[PDB]
mmCIF file with all atom_site columns, C-alpha atoms in Angstrom:
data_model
loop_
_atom_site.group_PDB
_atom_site.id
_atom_site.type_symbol
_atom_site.label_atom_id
_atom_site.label_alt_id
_atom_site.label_comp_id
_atom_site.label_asym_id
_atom_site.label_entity_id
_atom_site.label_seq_id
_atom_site.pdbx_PDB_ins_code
_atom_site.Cartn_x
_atom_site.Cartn_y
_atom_site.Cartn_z
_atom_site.occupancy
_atom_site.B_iso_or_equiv
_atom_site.pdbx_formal_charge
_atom_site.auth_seq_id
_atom_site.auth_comp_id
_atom_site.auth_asym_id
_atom_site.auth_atom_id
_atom_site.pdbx_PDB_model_num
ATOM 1   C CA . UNK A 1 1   ? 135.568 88.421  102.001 1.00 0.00 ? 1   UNK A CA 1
ATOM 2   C CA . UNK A 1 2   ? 138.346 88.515  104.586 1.00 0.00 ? 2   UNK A CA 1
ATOM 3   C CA . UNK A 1 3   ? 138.130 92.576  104.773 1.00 0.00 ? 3   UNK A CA 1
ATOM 4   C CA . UNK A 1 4   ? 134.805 93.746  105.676 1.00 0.00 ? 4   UNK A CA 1
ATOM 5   C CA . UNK A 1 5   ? 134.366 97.682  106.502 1.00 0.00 ? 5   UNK A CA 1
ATOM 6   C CA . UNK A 1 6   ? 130.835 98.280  106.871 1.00 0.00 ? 6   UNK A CA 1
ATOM 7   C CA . UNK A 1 7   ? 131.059 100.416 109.923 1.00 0.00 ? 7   UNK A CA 1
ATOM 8   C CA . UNK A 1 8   ? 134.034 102.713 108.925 1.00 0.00 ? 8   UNK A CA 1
ATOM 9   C CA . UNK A 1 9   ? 131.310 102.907 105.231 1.00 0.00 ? 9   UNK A CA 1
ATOM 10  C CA . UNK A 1 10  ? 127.973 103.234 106.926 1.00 0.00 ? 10  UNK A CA 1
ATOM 11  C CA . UNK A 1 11  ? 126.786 106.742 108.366 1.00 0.00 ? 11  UNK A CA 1
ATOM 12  C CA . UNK A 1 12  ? 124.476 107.648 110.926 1.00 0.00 ? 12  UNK A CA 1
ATOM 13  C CA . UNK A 1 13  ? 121.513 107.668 108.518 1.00 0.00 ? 13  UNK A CA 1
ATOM 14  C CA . UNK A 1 14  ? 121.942 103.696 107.385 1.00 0.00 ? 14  UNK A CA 1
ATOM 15  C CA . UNK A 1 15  ? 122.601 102.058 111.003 1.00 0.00 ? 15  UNK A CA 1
ATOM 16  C CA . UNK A 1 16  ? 122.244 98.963  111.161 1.00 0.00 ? 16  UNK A CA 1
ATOM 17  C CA . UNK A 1 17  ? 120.758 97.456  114.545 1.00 0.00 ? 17  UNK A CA 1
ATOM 18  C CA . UNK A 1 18  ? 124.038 94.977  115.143 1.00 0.00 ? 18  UNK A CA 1
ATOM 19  C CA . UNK A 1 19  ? 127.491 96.169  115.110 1.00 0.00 ? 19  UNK A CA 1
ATOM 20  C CA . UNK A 1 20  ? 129.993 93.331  115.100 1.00 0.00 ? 20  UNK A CA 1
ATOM 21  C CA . UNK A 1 21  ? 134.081 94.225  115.392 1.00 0.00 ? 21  UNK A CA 1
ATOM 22  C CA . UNK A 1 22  ? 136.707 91.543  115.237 1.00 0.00 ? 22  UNK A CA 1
ATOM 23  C CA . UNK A 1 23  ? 140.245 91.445  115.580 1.00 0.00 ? 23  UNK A CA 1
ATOM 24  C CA . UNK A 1 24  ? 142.095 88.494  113.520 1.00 0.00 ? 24  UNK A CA 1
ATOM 25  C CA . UNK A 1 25  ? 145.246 86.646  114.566 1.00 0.00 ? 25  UNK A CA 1
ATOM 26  C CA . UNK A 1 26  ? 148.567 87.286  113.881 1.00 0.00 ? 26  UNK A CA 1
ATOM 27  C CA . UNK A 1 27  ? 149.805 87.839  110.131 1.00 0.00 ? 27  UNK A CA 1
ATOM 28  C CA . UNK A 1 28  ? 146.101 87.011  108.971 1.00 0.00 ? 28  UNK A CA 1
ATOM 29  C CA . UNK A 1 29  ? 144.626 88.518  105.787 1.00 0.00 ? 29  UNK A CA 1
ATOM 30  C CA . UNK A 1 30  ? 142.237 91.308  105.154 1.00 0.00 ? 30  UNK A CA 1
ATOM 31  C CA . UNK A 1 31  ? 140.630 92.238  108.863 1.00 0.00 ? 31  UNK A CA 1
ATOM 32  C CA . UNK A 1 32  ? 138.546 89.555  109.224 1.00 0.00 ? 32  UNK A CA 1
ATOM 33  C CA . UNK A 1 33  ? 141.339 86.433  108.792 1.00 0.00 ? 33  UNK A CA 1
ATOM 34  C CA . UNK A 1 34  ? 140.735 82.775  108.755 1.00 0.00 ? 34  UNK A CA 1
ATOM 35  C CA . UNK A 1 35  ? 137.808 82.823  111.319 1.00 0.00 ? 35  UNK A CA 1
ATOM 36  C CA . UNK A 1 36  ? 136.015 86.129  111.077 1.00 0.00 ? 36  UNK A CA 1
ATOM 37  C CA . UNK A 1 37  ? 134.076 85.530  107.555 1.00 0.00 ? 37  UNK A CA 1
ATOM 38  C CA . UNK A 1 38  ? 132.251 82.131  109.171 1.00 0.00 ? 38  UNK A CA 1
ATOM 39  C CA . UNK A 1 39  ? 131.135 84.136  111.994 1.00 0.00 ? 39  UNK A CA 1
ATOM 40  C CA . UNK A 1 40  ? 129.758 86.923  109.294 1.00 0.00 ? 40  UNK A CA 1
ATOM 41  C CA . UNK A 1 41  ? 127.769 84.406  107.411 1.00 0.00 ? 41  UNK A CA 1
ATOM 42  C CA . UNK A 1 42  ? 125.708 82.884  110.023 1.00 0.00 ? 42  UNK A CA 1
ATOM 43  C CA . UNK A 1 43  ? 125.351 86.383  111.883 1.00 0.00 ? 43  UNK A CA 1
ATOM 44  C CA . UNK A 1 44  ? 123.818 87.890  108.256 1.00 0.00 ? 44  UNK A CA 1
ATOM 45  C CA . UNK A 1 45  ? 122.222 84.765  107.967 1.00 0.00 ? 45  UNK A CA 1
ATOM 46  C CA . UNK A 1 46  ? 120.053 85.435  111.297 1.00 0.00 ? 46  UNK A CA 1
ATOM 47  C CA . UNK A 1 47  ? 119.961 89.236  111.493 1.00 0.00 ? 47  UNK A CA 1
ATOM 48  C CA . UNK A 1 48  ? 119.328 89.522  107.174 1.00 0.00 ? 48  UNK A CA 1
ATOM 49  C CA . UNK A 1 49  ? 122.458 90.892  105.667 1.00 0.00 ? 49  UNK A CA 1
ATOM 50  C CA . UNK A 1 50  ? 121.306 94.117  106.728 1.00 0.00 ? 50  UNK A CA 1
ATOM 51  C CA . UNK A 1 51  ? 120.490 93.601  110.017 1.00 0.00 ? 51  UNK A CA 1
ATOM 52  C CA . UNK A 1 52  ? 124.190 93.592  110.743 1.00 0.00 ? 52  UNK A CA 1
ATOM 53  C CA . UNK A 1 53  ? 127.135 95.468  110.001 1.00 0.00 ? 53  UNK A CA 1
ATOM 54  C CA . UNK A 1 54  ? 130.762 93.457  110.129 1.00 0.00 ? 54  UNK A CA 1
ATOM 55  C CA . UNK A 1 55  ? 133.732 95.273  110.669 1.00 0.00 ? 55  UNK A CA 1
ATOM 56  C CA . UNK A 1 56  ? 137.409 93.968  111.438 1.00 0.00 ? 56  UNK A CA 1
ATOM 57  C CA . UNK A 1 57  ? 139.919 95.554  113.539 1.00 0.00 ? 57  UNK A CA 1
ATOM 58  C CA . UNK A 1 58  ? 142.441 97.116  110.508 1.00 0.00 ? 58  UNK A CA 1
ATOM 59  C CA . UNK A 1 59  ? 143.984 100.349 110.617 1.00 0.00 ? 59  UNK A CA 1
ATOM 60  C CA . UNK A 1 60  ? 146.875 100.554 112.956 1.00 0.00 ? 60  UNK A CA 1
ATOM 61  C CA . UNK A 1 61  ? 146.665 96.865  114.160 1.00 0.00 ? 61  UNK A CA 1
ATOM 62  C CA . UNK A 1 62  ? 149.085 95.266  111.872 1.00 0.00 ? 62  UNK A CA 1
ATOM 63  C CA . UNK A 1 63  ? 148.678 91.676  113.882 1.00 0.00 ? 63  UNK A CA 1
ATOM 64  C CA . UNK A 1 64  ? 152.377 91.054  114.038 1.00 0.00 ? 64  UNK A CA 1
ATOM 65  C CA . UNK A 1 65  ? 153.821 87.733  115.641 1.00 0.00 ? 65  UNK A CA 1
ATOM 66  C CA . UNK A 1 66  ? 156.199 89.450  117.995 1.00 0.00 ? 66  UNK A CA 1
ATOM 67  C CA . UNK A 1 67  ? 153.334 91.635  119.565 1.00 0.00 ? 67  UNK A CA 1
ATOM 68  C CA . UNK A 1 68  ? 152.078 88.652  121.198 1.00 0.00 ? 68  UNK A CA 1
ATOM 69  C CA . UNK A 1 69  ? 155.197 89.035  123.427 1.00 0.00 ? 69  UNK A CA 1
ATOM 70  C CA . UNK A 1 70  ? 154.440 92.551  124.556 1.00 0.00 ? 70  UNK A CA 1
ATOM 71  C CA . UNK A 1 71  ? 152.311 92.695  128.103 1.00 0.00 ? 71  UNK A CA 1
ATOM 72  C CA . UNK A 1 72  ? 149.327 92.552  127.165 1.00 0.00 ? 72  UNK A CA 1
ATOM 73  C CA . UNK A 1 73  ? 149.465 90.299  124.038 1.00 0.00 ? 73  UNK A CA 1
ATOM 74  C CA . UNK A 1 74  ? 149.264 92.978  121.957 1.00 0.00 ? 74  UNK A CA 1
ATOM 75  C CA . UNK A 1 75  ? 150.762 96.760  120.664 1.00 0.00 ? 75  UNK A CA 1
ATOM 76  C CA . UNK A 1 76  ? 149.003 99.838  122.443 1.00 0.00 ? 76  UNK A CA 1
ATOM 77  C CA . UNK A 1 77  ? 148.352 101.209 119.004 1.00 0.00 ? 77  UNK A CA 1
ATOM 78  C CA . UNK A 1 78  ? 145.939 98.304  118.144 1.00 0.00 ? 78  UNK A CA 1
ATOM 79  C CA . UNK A 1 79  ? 144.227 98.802  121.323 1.00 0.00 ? 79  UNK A CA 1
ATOM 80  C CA . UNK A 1 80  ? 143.363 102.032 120.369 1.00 0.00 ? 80  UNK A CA 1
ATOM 81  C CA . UNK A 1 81  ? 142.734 101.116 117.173 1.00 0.00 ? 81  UNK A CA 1
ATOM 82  C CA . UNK A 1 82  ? 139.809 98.865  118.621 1.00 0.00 ? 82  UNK A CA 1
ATOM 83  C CA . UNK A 1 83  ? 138.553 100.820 120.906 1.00 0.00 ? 83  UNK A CA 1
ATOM 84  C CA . UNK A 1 84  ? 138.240 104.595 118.536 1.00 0.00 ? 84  UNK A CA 1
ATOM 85  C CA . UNK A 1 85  ? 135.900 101.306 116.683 1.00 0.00 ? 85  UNK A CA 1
ATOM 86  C CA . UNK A 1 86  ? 133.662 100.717 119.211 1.00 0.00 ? 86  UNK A CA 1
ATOM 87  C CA . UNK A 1 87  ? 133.488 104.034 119.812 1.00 0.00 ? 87  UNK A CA 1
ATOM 88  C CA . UNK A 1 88  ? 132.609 105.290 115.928 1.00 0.00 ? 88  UNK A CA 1
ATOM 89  C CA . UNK A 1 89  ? 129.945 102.269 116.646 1.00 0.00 ? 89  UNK A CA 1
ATOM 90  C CA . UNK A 1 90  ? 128.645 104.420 119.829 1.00 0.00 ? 90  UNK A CA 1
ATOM 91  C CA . UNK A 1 91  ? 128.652 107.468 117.818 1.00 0.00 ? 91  UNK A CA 1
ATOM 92  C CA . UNK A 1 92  ? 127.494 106.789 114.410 1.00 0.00 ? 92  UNK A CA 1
ATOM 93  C CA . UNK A 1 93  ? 124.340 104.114 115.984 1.00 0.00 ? 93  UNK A CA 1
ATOM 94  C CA . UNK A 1 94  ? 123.372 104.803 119.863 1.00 0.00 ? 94  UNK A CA 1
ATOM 95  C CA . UNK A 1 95  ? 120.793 102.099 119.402 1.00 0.00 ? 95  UNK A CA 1
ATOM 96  C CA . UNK A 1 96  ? 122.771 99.252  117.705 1.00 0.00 ? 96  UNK A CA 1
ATOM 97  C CA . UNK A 1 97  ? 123.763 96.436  119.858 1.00 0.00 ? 97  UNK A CA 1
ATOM 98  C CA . UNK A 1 98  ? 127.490 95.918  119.685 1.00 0.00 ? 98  UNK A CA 1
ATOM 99  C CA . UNK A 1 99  ? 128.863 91.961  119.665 1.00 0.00 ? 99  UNK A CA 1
ATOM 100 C CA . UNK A 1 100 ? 132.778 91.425  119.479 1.00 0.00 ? 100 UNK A CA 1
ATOM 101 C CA . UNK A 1 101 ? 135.157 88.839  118.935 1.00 0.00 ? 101 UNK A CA 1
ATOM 102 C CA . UNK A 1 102 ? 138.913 87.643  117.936 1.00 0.00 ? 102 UNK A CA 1
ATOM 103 C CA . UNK A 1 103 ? 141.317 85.308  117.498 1.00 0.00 ? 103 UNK A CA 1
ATOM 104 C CA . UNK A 1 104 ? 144.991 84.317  119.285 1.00 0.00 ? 104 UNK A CA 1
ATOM 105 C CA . UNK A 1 105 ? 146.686 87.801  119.254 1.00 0.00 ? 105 UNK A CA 1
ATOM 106 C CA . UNK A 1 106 ? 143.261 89.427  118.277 1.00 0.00 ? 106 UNK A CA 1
ATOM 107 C CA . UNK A 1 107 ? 141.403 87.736  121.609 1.00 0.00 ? 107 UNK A CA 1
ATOM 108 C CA . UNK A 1 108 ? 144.326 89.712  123.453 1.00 0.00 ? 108 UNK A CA 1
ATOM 109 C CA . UNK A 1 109 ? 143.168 92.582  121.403 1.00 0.00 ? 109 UNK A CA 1
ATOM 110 C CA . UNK A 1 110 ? 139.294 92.014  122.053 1.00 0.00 ? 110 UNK A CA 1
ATOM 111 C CA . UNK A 1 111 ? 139.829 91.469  125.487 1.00 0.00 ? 111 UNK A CA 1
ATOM 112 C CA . UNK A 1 112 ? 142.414 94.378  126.337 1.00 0.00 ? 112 UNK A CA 1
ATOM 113 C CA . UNK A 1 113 ? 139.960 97.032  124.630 1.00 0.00 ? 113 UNK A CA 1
ATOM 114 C CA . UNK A 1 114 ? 137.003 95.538  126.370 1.00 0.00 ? 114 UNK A CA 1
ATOM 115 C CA . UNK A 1 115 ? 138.744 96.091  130.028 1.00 0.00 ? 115 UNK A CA 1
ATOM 116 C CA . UNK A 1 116 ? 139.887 99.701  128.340 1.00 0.00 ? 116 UNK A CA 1
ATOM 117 C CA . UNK A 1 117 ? 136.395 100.851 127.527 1.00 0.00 ? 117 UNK A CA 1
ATOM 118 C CA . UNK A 1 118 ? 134.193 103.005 130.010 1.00 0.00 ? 118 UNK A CA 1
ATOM 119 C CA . UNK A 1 119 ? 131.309 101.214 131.062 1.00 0.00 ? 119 UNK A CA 1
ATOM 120 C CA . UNK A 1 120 ? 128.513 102.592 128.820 1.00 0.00 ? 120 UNK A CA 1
ATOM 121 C CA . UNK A 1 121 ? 130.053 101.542 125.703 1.00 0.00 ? 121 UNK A CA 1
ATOM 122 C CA . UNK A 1 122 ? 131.106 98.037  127.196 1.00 0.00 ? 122 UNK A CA 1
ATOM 123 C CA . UNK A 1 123 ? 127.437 97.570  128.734 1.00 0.00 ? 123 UNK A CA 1
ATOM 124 C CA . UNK A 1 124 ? 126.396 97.512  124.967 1.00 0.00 ? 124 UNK A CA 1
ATOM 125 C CA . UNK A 1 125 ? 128.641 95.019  124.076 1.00 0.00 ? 125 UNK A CA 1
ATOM 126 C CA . UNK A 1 126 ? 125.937 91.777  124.451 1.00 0.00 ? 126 UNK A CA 1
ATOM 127 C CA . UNK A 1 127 ? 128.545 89.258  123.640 1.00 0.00 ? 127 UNK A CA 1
ATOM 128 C CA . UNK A 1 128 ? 131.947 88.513  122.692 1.00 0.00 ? 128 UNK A CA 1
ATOM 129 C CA . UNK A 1 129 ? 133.657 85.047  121.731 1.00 0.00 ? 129 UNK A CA 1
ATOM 130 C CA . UNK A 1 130 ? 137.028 84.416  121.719 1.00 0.00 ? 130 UNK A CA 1
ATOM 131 C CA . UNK A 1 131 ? 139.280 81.919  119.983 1.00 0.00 ? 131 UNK A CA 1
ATOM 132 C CA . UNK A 1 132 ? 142.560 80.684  121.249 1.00 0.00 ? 132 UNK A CA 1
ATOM 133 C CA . UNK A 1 133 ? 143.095 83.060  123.808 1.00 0.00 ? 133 UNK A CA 1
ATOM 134 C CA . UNK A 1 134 ? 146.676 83.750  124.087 1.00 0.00 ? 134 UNK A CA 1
ATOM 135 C CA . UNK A 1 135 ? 145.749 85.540  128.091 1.00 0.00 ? 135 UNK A CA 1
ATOM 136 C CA . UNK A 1 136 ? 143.186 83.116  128.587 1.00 0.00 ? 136 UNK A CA 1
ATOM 137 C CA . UNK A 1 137 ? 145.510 81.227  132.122 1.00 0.00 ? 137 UNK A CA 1
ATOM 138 C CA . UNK A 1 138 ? 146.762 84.653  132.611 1.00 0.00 ? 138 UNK A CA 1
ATOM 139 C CA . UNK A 1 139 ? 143.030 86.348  132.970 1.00 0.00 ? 139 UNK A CA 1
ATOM 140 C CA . UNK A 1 140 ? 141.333 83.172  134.419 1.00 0.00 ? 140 UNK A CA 1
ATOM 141 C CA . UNK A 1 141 ? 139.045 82.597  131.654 1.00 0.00 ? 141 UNK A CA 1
ATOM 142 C CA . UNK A 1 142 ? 137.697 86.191  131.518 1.00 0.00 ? 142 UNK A CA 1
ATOM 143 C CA . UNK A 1 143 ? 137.640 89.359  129.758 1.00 0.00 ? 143 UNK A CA 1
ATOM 144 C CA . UNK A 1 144 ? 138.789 92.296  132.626 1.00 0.00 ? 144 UNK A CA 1
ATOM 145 C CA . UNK A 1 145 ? 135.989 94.160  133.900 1.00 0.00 ? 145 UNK A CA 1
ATOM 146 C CA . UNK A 1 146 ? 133.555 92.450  131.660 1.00 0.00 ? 146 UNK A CA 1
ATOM 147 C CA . UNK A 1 147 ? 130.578 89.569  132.574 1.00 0.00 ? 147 UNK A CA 1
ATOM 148 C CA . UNK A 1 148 ? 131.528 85.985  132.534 1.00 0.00 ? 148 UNK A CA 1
ATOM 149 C CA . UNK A 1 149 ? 128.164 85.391  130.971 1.00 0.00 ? 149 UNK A CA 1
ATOM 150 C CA . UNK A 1 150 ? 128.695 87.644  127.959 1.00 0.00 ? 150 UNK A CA 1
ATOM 151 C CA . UNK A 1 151 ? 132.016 86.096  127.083 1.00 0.00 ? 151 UNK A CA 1
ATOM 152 C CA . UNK A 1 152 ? 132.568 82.699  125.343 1.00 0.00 ? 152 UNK A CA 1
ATOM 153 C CA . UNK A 1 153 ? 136.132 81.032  125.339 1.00 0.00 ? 153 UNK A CA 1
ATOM 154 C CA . UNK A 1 154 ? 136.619 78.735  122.693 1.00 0.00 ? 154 UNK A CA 1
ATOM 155 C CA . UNK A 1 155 ? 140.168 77.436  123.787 1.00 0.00 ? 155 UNK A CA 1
ATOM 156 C CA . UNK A 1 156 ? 140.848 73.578  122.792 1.00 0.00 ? 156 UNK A CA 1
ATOM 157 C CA . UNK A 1 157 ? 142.428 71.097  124.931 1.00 0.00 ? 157 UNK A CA 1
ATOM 158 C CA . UNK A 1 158 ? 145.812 70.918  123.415 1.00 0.00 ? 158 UNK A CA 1
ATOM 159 C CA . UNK A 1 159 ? 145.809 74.503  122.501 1.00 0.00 ? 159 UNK A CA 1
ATOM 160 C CA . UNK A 1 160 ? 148.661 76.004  124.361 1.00 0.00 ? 160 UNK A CA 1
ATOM 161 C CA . UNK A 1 161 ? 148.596 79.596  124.122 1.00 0.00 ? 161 UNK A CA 1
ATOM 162 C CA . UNK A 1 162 ? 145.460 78.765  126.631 1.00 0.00 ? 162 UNK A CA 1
ATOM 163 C CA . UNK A 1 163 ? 147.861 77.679  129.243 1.00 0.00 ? 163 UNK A CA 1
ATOM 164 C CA . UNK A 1 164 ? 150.098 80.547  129.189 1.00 0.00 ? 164 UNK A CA 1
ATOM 165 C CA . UNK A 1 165 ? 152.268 79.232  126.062 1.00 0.00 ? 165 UNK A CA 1
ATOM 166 C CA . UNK A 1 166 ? 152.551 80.892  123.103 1.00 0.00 ? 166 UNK A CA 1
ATOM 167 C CA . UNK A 1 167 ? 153.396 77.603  120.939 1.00 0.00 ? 167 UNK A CA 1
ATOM 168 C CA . UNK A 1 168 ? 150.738 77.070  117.942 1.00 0.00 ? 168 UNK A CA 1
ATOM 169 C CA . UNK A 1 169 ? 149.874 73.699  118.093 1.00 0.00 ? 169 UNK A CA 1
ATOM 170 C CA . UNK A 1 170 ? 147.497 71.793  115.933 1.00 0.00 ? 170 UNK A CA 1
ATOM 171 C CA . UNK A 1 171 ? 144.034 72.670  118.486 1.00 0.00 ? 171 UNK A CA 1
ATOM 172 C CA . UNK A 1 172 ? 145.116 76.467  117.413 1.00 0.00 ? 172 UNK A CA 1
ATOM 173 C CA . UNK A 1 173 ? 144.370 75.678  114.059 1.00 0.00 ? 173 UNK A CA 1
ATOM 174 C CA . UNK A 1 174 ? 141.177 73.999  114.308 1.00 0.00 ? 174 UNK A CA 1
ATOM 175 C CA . UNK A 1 175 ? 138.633 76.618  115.413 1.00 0.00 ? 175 UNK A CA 1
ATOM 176 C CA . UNK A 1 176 ? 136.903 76.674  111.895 1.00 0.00 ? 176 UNK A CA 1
ATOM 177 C CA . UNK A 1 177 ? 133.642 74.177  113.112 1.00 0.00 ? 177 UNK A CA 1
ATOM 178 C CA . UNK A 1 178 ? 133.427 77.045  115.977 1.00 0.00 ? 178 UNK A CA 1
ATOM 179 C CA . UNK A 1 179 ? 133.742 79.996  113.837 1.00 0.00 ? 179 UNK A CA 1
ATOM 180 C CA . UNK A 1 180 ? 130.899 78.553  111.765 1.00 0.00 ? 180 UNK A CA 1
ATOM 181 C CA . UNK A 1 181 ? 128.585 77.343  114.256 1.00 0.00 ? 181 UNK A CA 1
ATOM 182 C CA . UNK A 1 182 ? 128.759 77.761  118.181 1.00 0.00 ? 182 UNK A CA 1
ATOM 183 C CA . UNK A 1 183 ? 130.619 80.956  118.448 1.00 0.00 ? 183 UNK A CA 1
ATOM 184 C CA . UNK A 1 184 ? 127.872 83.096  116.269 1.00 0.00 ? 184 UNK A CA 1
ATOM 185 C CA . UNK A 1 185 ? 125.010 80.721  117.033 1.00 0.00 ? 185 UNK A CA 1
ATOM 186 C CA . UNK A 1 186 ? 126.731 82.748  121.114 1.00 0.00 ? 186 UNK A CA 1
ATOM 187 C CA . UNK A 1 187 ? 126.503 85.942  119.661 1.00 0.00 ? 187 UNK A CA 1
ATOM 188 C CA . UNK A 1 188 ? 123.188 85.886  118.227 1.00 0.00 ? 188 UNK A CA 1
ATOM 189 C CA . UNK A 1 189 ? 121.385 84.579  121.408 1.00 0.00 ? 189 UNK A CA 1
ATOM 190 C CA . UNK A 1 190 ? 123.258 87.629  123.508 1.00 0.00 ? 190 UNK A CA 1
ATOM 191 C CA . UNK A 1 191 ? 121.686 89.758  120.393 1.00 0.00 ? 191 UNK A CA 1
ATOM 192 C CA . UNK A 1 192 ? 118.330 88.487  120.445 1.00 0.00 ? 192 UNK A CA 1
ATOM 193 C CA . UNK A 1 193 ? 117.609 88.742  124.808 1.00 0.00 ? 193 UNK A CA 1
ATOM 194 C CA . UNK A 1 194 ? 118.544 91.867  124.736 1.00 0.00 ? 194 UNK A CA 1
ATOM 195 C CA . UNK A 1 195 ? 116.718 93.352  121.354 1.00 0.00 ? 195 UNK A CA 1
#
């Protein structure tokens, strides 16, 4: 559904060998919001449902709409929220590839926890899309400290929280064909090179 936990519920015993984490956007449902159960299916559908454990950013990020106006696009306390997940991912499975992703305030999120990380946690992270990327002008495209080549920008003309607005327009809206196709079909090429 929109709330998937299987990272916070697995143990070190039943790792899976993918470990995706996405952040939703802002006042979205469960952890997983609008986009975040599209990418699930076609990742379980490549990896086998348990070839790949989906987990959204919950916990302290509560995805409000007037975070988005705070410096980095998001609250400190959902920063660490996302990054004490990748590190629980680190932890609990040392072996599992890590992929990443969010939407609007949650591509703030992604991104800000990303730059935040040290490097051998980020170096696992093979690939991470993002979806109307409210710092996308601000960080010229890119994730701080993190390749160009593992990161994916879906940001649609017309979308102007690309272009340093934070107006939702109608391209905000319409990332569902990439949710369900391009941005895993991203993620599970990053997966597959390096396993």
């Amino acid at each position: 559904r929109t709330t998937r936990d299987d990272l916070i519920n697995g143990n070190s015993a039943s790792c899976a060998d993918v470990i995706f984490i996405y952040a939703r956007g802002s006042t979205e449902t469960g952890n997983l919001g609008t986009l975040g159960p599209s990418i699930a299916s076609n990742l379980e559908s490549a990896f086998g449902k348990d070839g790949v454990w989906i987990q959204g950013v919950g916990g302290a990020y509560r995805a409000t709409l007037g975070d988005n106006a705070l410096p980095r696009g998001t609250s400190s306390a959902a920063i660490r929220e996302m990054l004490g997940l990748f590190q629980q991912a680190n932890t609990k499975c040392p072996d599992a590839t890590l992929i990443a992703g969010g939407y609007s305030q949650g591509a703030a999120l992604a991104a800000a926890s990303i730059e935040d990380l040290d490097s051998a946690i980020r170096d696992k992270i093979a690939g991470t899309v993002l979806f109307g990327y409210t710092k996308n002008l601000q960080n010229r495209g890119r994730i701080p400290n993190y390749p160009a080549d593992r990161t994916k920008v879906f940001c649609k003309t017309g979308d102007l929280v690309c272009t340093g607005s934070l107006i939702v327009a109608a391209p905000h809206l319409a990332y569902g064909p990439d949710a369900r196709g391009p941005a895993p079909e991203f993620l599970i090429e990053k997966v597959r090179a390096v396993r």
